[PDB]
Structure 1
Amino acid sequence: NIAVAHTDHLSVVYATMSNFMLNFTNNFSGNHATFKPDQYVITSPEGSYKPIIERQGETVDGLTIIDTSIVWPILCQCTYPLVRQEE
């Protein structure tokens, strides 16, 4: 019932989004095996070493932690914009 609006409509908003000014970097390449992000270290001869993507537990901001339980409200109970016959 959902792929009707989901693949057809969510997909586009996503693609348009793949081109947002800031969302830079690289996120994937469709391959689960092999693709490993590119690392960046701000290195300095004077003995500086602060890498960009470092792993450091859950921050206060509140993003670090991913929570898969979110799949259900999206999958089971969440009305759509182009699903039940809005513009």
Structure 2
Amino acid sequence: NIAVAHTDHLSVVYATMSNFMLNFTNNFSGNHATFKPDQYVITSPEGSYKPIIERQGETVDGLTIIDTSIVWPILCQCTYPLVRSIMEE
């Protein structure tokens, strides 16, 4: 019931967001078996070493931990313009 709203609408939103100016990283290549993110550092002979990607545990921003249960409201507690009288701009 919900799939057309994903594939035929939300996917377009991903395709555009992917070209946004600030989405500068390559997040994934679609191959779980081999994909590994590119890893850069600011670094100097004076000995500074700043990784761009660090493992720092939960942060104040709250973006770090992932509740996968978010999957549930989506499948069974959300309307969409394509899925749901049924015309909607």
Q: TM-score range by the shorter chain?
A: over 0.9
> What's the TM-score, normalizing by structure 2?
0.93
The answer to which of 76-85 and 58-67 deviates more is 76-85
Question: How many residue pairs align between the two structures?
Answer: 87
**Identity across aligned pairs (percent)?**
99
Query: How far off its partner does 1:81 sit?
Result: 1.1
Query: How far off its partner does 1:77 sit?
Result: 1.0
Distance (whole Å) between structure 1 residues aligned to residue 50 and residue 70 of structure 2? 33
Distance (whole Å) between structure 2 residues aligned to residue 6 and residue 35 of structure 1? 25
User: Counterpart of 1:19?
Assistant: 19
Show CA shifts across 1:7-29 (max 9, x none): 10000011011100101110111
User: Counterpart of 1:86?
Assistant: 88
Show CA shifts across 1:11-70 (max 9, x none): 001101110010111011110011100001111000101111000000001100111010
Following superposition of structure 1 onto structure 2, how do residues 62-77 of structure 1 map, counting pairs within 5 Å? Answer: 62-77=62-77
Distance (whole Å) between structure 1 residues aligned to residue 5 and residue 25 of structure 2? 28
Distance (whole Å) between structure 2 residues aligned to residue 14 and residue 37 of structure 1? 20
Query: How far off its partner does 1:4 sit?
Result: 1.2
Give the secondary-structure state (helix, strand or coil) at the position aligned to 2:69: helix
> What's the TM-score, normalizing by structure 1?
0.95
Which runs of 5 or more residues in structure 2 are unaligned? none
Distance (whole Å) between structure 1 residues aligned to residue 56 and residue 48 of structure 2? 18
Which runs of 5 or more residues in structure 1 are unaligned? none
The answer to which of 76-85 and 7-16 deviates more is 76-85
